[PDB]
Amino acid sequence: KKYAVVLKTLTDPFWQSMKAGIEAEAKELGVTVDIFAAASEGDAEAQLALFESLSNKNYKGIAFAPLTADNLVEPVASAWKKGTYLVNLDDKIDMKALKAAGGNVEAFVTTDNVAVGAQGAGYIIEKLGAEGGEVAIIEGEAGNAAGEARTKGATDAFDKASNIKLVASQPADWDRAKAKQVATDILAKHPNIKAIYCANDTMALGVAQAVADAGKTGKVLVVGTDGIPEAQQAVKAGKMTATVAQNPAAIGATGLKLMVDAQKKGKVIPLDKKPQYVLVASKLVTKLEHHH
């Protein structure tokens, strides 16, 4: 049989890299993998419906990145009861809710997202120096576990830092236009803002455009997360200050490998057993300076 992967979306580069990484790993393992996302973008109910349709196609295993912590709880529990080998990718499902629903997953593969936020905020703190300044966080969608961890890690770092004042922490729901809108509002209400940490690059690129439109490119630091090509290009060009790169290809490849390796014991993970927890490294991408 084959394996299935349900991602948040296939239109955005972070997730496209994850799909490509899954396929590269499938090519090394010699397994067949179908990778999907639901047509309605960001629709948690559409993604549930997609998951439910796949869970009835006799896949050996399904890896999934849920759009929210709760939207896939019931169909994941249902698949576990059917003996499906399940791997949570990237964004943490509500595991206590999953257990209450009667299910489990073999593994969760993710980035240390508290560390991501701490790195993004930490680089801002380093770049602002002793004088510090007003900073803001553009959050992902409220309640998404990975985004929440980044907000926590950044907020904690900013709170401890001398002369840093976090003046705004606001969701833009992983959306570039909405992040441009939120950044425009922050720039209007906080004309002394010195830096904005953004929970992903889709948002950071919108923020960078708001900063440019305000004539403030280089005057307001903009840090993203994911490391998508356009953000790495923005960092090179000075349009973004940095981005905390993730490795979506490795997240996907590792999740597929865990799903394949899980079947060797001939049974899905017991209900009372803790899933595997596999961290994939992040890396701060800054403007490459070799000039003394």
Ligand SMILES: OC[C@H]1O[C@@H](O)[C@H](O)[C@H](O)[C@@H]1O
């Ligand atoms: O889909 C929006 C975002 O979801 C997070 O959970 C992922 O780690 C990436 O940052 C992605 O860009």
